[PDB]
Symmetry: D2
């Protein structure tokens, strides 16, 4: 069941968080934060810029110094601190999910039952790794003793998007901290509020000062200061392909800092004629419409074998027509607004491209409501590979359905994109499930499901959907720096 907050939400944390203390901006400037369902201002927040990032990096550097509390404490104690943080987020789950829904335009049902649960579970998963990060002893040639340290890297700048503010915050800080790094986080200008509340809880949990610093502010200002900073060792980023390139270029130009990116997708589904049809329709629908289409792994190209294409389209239209738009905080509402005017415009323009380029509009196709950035859930049939709605990430509630009859050819079509984040395959045939999944150039492939993400799984893109992996055993590698220590000895023995 679905509990709610019983007193109205009051916003408290609006300042920059450095050395576990709350800071005004060096400039004195603040910026507004809005509710996307009402277009009304919720509060003002201190606007971080290069001077504030500089303060946060110096604090993160000082907390990372050899001999510091965060460097010398037991690994197991880093893990305890992360488990306590998860306990505290659990405690404040009602408040955080409400704030997430109100600032982010996110259905409260999903914010409470999915986002917040995933934040808690991911933190507890990361806590468990902290004292299980291990190097190696190595039987090198010659009379030497050689071992490796999987050290933390150092100061990690972490630029977060607006579509999953808390979840991206925890996906970034959980592994970074578990491995022993210090972090400077720049949440989305649209959604700073839940991150600043979590900073409240980082202080309360007892993390040493400077281990986590949160600098709300804008992209070209505070984000770019992180990108180009000469004393940040690594930057991680989720967001647009265009910013990813600007960050990688900034990193190369300054100090050759390590960079990992996750950059969205144009993720395809392949539905074979032998698929459980209803199960395939339901998962592909959820794949593309989840959180108003504002998901990196949105299932935005659905290829269906011709034998079942018309039934698939018909059943998808029926399911898309069952939504209730409105304020994401009211029970029974099933689709909230898009995040802001930029994204709203982009979606409507792409919808229009679909009409003009010859797609078949099955439902939706326009905006909704007196206020709020609402888009009707929209389904296009007979989409072809050349159209803009087939090539460009939409990030809105807009489903594309295509037909195929040759399996060889539909795999090339699925792979014929610079994106590569995820894909889905729907079949009952063992051999097809394995060989299709092996052939798809995508970081996660779901078989007879879609959108299944868990802390135990590495997650990331092929090709221009990004580089590196997050979470799982494998994602922890990207938050360590390997040092080889080789000691001369008089005689080695196996």
């Amino acid at each position: 069941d679905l509990p709610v907050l019983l007193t109205d939400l009051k916003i408290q944390y609006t300042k920059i968080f450095i050395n576990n203390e709350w800071h005004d901006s060096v400039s004195g400037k603040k910026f507004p934060v809005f509710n996307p369902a009402t277009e009304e201002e919720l509060c003002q927040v201190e606007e971080g810029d290069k001077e504030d990032v500089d303060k946060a990096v110096k604090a993160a550097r000082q907390a990372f110094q050899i001999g510091s509390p965060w460097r010398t404490m037991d690994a197991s104690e880093r893990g305890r601190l992360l488990y306590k943080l998860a306990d505290l987020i659990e405690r404040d789950r009602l408040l955080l999910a409400t704030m997430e829904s109100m600032n982010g335009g996110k259905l409260y049902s999903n914010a409470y039952l999915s986002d917040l649960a995933g934040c808690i579970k991911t933190l507890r998963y990361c806590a468990g790794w902290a004292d299980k990060i291990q190097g190696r002893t190595i039987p090198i040639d010659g009379n030497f003793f050689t071992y490796t340290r999987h050290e933390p890297i150092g100061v990690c700048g972490q630029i977060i998007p607006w579509n999953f503010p808390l979840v991206m915050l925890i996906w970034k800080i959980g592994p970074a901290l578990s491995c022993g790094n210090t972090v400077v986080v720049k949440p989305a200008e649209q959604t700073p509020l839940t991150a600043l509340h979590v900073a409240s809880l980082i202080k309360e949990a007892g993390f040493p000062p400077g281990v986590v610093n949160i600098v709300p502010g804008y992209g070209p200002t505070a984000g770019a200061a992180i990108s180009s900073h000469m004393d940040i060792d690594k930057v991680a980023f989720t967001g647009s392909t265009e910013v990813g390139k600007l960050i990688k270029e900034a990193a190369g130009k300054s100090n050759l800092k390590r960079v990992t990116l996750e950059l969205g997708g144009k993720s395809p589904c392949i539905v074979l004629a032998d698929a459980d049809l209803d199960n395939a329709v339901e998962f592909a629908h959820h794949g593309v419409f989840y959180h108003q289409g504002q998901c990196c792994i949105a299932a935005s190209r659905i290829f269906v074998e011709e034998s079942i294409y018309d039934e698939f389209v018909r059943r998808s239209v029926e399911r898309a027509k069952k939504y209730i738009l409105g304020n994401p905080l009211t029970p029974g509402v099933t689709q909230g607004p898009q995040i802001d005017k930029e994204q709203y415009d982009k979606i409507l323009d792409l919808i229009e491209s679909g009409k003009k380029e010859g797609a078949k509009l099955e439902c939706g196709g326009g905006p909704w409501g007196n206020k709020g950035y609402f888009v009707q859930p929209t389904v296009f049939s007979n989409v072809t590979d050349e159209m803009r709605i087939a090539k460009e990430e939409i990030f809105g509630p807009v489903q594309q359905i295509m037909k195929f009859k040759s399996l060889d050819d539909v795999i090339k079509r699925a792979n014929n994109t610079f994106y590569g984040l995820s894909a889905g395959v729907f079949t009952k045939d063992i051999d097809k499930a394995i060989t299709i999944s092996s052939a798809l150039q995508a970081g996660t492939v779901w078989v007879n499901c879609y959108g299944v993400v868990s802390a135990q799984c590495p997650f990331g893109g092929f090709k221009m959907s990004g580089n590196g992996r997050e979470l799982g055993e494998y994602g922890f590698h990207e938050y360590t720096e390997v040092k080889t220590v080789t000691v001369k000895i008089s005689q080695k023995n196996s």
Copy 2:
């Protein structure tokens, strides 16, 4: 294609191999070795007993001493020696396969194309691991530096069976040597000859003396001396369940040496109605009839969904009727003899149990020929779970076919055995393949195939089919002893 030896085989190596030199038995006694297809003596071999095992252990201990060549050489050089050994076995492939076929009663086609290839591939696989065996550096609580060494264990006694003499020899010595152990090998009394030729090649490859010692002889004599030896650190064994118990009891009684066993099976296949029927018939047939049924993983219980049972039986009988019995060295012969009189008697007695207990004899059922331990390939239909041919490992060319209609119940029947070595599942359904394979209590489960063994895969039994795993990454663990080194330091840093 299938090349052959162009001059008749001459036997050269018949003595005990210790410190890379050839030894007469301390007693002076020798024992005969026979050809199972003719019942004729091939040669005499030095008979090892406790006094000879004692000599081999002392040499293996001396080669394992700290500061010795085998302990101090680079890991990568251990690997080079194993690759050279594989090169030499490749060179002598015609001779070894001929000797294997003549001493072991093994089809020459299979000895040359399967056994010898697997020996070569397994050695090269093991060679590659030698300098990739690694310990760990560990973020222990407190101000300490902690690392682990995955050392070799020490002197490993390795008791080999007669059904795959070369392959079992290499499965044992490949991982043992790669990890840095020294070994005392006791090949089957029935099949010492290929092992002694490989000892020729171990000397030729340059292995330091005492690293490999081979002591041909009998089980209750030389085998038991290994089992109960107070200076052997580990014993590995493949063979009967009954000897496994005698070895484990001997080990516990003497020096608590480490023990790994592989002990055969009563491995089941489950054939669902949606299976590729011909593919299932072919693989299950090969599973149970390979090497005259003398395989640990023989598919000796085949459960078939009632819908397809009668067709399955009919097609299996047709395939079983296509064999040519005779000397395993003549081209076109497709079934050789059983290994000796004990096994031959055991098979015929169990065949008779099948008749008397009410099984349906579809073909075969008796012996064959003027000489040689030949058994007609035999198929039983309508087998029930209580019969001896359903409960006891036969190790002969004897196939059991049963019907089921409830999948829940057939999984319990498949699992209702103290054996647990392997199993097979035949279905096109993804979900059934995964959930059935997960539910079966068996060390290897094949899906839509059977009998697929490779050096990259760990291999071993559940339950009384044995303990531990051989080959793969995982099997290397059982040839190392982990040492934790924990060093006090003034201050640790992550």
Copy 3:
């Protein structure tokens, strides 16, 4: 600081724990449990025997069945249950440490600050592994998809000793449960009480019934029923070398169950002339006198370079003369009783052997007090390798100090034992620390410290000190059974 329980301890849990319910013994029999510091009975406990073990195994088997809650719950939820159990033991830390001290004769300071802390930390460590136990995908030869499952083994029987009742309980159940096994635990007849209280907390934490079953009782009765049980898949044991052999023999005779043992030691220290002398004296003293000498890793042979031997002996005698004997619950008491009459007799007899065989008694040498199994802390100088106090594990407060001058020779002396659990090396020289530690045949080697045990480190014996490893990454391997699944596919791709 050191808090205490403010009301006297009341014993509540005295029955057999099966399917999360409290059971009388099938026989109706109970047995007394005593306080070793007073020789007075504390309470009576239900006496488990073969019939009760049979009940516990059936429940553990049923909880392990495919489809059961414990088999189907998320791995991460197994970990949550273990973290909650740790939270509950933390809650009851005062009660548990008091009960541990009163039943076990264990200094309350140590029980509270060391045993209980280690129990809590070890559980939290094990919790973190639960959803990080992973198998492999393997690039086998041929057109196959091959993966491995690291399944739980099944029903694990766990026989616990009296010297560290809670810590051994958690060392056993933490990894077993994390990996997904079910357990039947048989605590020491002398110390059932803390285990039964923990069973209270396993129920309270929400573990499914039958996952943990605790059967207090005697060794030759309930212990032997576990050893020889035909439906227990694995047995783990810590205790005497003599029982280890009886367990391994019992396992071999019945169902070839997997066996891991830890069997004590005769662990040596090597003190070089360049060692920090005071640091070496302090750690070796603690090594041998900790918990009245009743530690598996007791530093019971201390070899000291002749240059510093007399100073080392003198300083060790001074430190041994500073103890206060008495009831382990009174503040300032620094040495408690031995556990029972058997151990007390054994210690006094061995002390007498030391006198008669010619050792130099420096202090102690006799019993103490009106009541309680107290032994004076005792130091022997000029010990030689032939004496009983040099060869036999004493398990009492009895220190042996020997001189050496040749480093080659003292390593052979240190290694000249069938034991092999641990060792210590004291030197400032890098090269000596590495090469000596590499040469010692011991499972853990401490350098410039002693007795440093942590959940992140694997722990176990070389040679007759046992087989397998506990805790660390590596120890988790011994609570899994590897299954290889190999799937035929039309075409594989790298």
Copy 4:
């Protein structure tokens, strides 16, 4: 001993290698290749440019297609091909070492005994990993089966420097191929010749066409075409910090390809007063003077405790005065030329900076000879942290020796650089060796040695010395792309 080629070297392979065939440049243009010891032209080579890189990428892409020989062959066969290549390089060791010495200006003794041996050993090491690259099976939340594939990435562009042509070639192609990638290699314009001979041997070994393509040519032309190519999935590079930035910027701008860099260093040694002084002098000398100073890990800042500084300097000057300059092919010659005029000028300019900025010139300081790019081996004493010879990588035979007295301060000085490739620590004290090595911000730290590189060790930079690691287990991660496959199932079981 040191065998030599008995007939003069004849150059044969001068063309572009694509699809295992030899190609003229699209332009028809060729470029000269010189001997640095004589300044004479050795031959002309086809000049690759963007059009030729385009041809090589298309071939590498085609060889990487699903269903291709290189994608479908057994992993173990990829390893066989790499072992055969190593066998062939061994066969041609005399020719390759001669060609390496003549084109690269590299002492023939070192080319034959070190470079060529390292090439052979590294290939054999990489061969062994090929069928040991494994993914995972993962206990994800929910009723799913989740596994990972560690796939090859795809087409990898590999830009090689002139200082270790063969060794860098093999460090790049060995791991790339072992993991299953295809490669487009661009050797240094100064040293294409040994790479083109190895391409001869790749064809001879049987690698499928298009798996390895070698495009000799210039940096701003063919190198930049690789950097910015829209169908290259990854680029690896060793060379200058300045090009690294140009490559990272090019990659970000085009297709966000993965990038790993190794970019040289300013690697420091710390020599404590208790060090084995002669051992420290010898290793630091070799560290900075090896291959005429043209090593990434050159020990170009040597900090020595004041107590021993003057003796250290004196002994280093004595050892530096013992060199014989001349043609690297004549026996007994111990220092060859620098590679070309650019590097020669850079070294002399930096030497002059040392004089003018106030360093103490102890020996050398000018050029040498009638012809060839020879620099006198040069030692500077009393170097301070501000001078150019302390800050800038020299890549010439130029040693800097500084004094320290505070260990805290000398660690900050050692770390006060944007470089971070390697470091050395010389002490007998265990605690100092561990804590100093832990505090140094460097990818490899040697203790009481220097310059010890082996295939089993990961190798790479901290900070601006580069990103990622090469060789070892860990370096293989950077040649794979992880795919998560998550399959919906009816019910999971642990």
